[PDB]
Amino acid sequence: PGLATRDPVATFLETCRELPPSVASIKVSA
Amino acid sequence: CSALLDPVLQAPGTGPAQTELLCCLVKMESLEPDAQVLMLGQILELPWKEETFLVLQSLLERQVEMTPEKFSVLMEKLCKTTSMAYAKLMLTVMTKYQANITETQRLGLAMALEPNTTFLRKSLKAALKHLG
Description:
By secondary structure, chain A is an all-alpha fold. Chain A is 33% helix and 0% strand. The two termini of chain A are 31 Å apart. The chains hardly touch. Chain A: This is Fanconi anemia core complex-associated protein 100.
């Protein structure tokens, strides 16, 4: 659109008990 | 200062002369505490550049009081970067307002601290260690 949520259960568990960028690259011949 | 500061610093070619006047303005013994807070509160909304940091250094040499939301905005802008006066700024906050600093602020610090284009890298790392 520059060229035109979270897990319920894993959250529920938490509620019931009481930064850098990654990178990747390659190089190929012309 | 609501008349003076904003336009002078929004202006381009804002030379060192003018920064030194504003530095002496914030060094005013007569600049009373609530005045210092409103000075800061007004500085916050602006596009921050080298001159903004140079001023703010002298401004917070007073050890002036910050609300948590305001310190939040401070550290937010402060996260974003090679500048050496900006190094002074980050150092001064880390040293003094460690009373105010938390872990995520310390993390955003670490992110902005990573650069070697910085000077006083070591000192900052030691301060950052000491925060932890």
